[PDB]
């Protein structure tokens, strides 16, 4: 059902070189599989556990403990808008309303075309330039609710 690619296995083993215990590469292995496939599927837990020599219970517990290791399928781009206190003061709620009214989804949902997945995140460490958003790898600061329909059109 699930088969790790050769590049994934080589990256996992090269990560395992860096640590005293091969269990210490579990987060990086999950991130490698997630970067290759968008999310970590069910058979990936057993594949990573077989590569690392630790039980699949611990790999599953690590994958479900960390919020940025997606254990459910996501869209092609994961929008992550900041929830925290400074972006609350600067008005992230307008940004959230603009994103919901443009994508027609609630947070934690995916659009019908699979293009975007809306997610609230914790503080992005960019509080003096808030409100802040993170599309897949790019941080967008100084957000305004009128800039959302233009900023979501450069992520096809």
Partner 1 sequence: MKNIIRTPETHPLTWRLRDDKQPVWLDEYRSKNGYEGARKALTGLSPDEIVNQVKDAGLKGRGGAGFSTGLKWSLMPKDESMNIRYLLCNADEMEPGTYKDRLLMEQLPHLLVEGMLISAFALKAYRGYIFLRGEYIEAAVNLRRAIAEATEAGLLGKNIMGTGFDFELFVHTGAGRYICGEETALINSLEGRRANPRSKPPFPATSGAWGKPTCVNNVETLCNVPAILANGVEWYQNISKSKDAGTKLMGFSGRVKNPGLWELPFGTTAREILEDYAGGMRDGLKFKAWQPGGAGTDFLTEAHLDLPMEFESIGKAGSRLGTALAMAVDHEINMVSLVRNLEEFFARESCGWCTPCRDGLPWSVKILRALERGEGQPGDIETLEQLCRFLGPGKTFCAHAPGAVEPLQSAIKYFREEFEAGIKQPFSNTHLINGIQPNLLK
Partner 2 sequence: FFRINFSRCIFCGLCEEACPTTAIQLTPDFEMGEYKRQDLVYEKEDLLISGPGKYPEYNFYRMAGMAIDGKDKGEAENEAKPIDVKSLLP
Partner 3 sequence: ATIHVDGKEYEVNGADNLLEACLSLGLDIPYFCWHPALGSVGACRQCAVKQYQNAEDTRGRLVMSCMTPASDGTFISIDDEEAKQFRESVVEWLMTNHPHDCPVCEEGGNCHLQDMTVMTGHSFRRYRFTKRTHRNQDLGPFISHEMNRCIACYRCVRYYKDYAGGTDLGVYGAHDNVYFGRPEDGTLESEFSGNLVEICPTGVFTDKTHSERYNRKWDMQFAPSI
* Stretch 45-64 residues interacting with partner 2 (CB under 8 A): 64
Instruction: Classify residue 75 by its DSSP letter.
Output: -
User: What is the CB neighbour count within 10 angstroms for residue 108?
Assistant: 10
Q: Cα(77)–Cα(101) distance, rounded to whole angstroms?
A: 17
* Stretch 96-115 residues interacting with partner 2 (CB under 8 A): 107-108
Q: Taking a C-beta distance cutoff of 8 angstroms, is the pair 148, 103 a contact?
A: no
26 vs 90, which CB is nearer to partner 3?
26
Please state the closest distance from residue 152 (CB atom) to partner 1, in A: 19
* Contacts to ligand FES by CB under 6 A: 82, 84-87, 123-127, 130, 132
Q: Taking a C-beta distance cutoff of 8 angstroms, is the pair 66, 104 a contact?
A: no
User: Footprint of partner 2 on this chain (CB under 8 A)?
Assistant: 64, 67, 70-72, 74, 107-108, 117, 119-122
């Amino acid at each position: 059902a699930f088969e790790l690619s050769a590049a994934e296995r080589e990256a996992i083993e090269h990560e395992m070189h860096h640590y005293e215990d091969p269990r210490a590469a579990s987060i990086e292995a999950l991130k490698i599989v997630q970067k290759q496939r968008g999310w970590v599927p069910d058979g990936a837990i057993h594949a990573i556990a077989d590569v690392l020599g630790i039980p699949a219970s611990d790999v599953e517990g690590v994958a479900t403990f960390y919020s940025q290791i997606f254990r459910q399928p996501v869209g092609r781009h994961v929008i992550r808008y900041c929830d925290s206190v400074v972006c609350h003061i600067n008005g992230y709620q307008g940004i959230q309303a603009a994103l919901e009214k443009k994508l027609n989804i609630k947070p934690g949902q995916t659009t019908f075309d699979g293009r975007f997945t809306l997610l609230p995140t914790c503080c992005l460490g960019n509080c003096d330039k808030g409100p802040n958003m993170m599309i897949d790898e790019d941080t967008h600061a100084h957000l305004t609710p009128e800039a959302i329909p233009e900023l979501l059109e450069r992520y096809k």
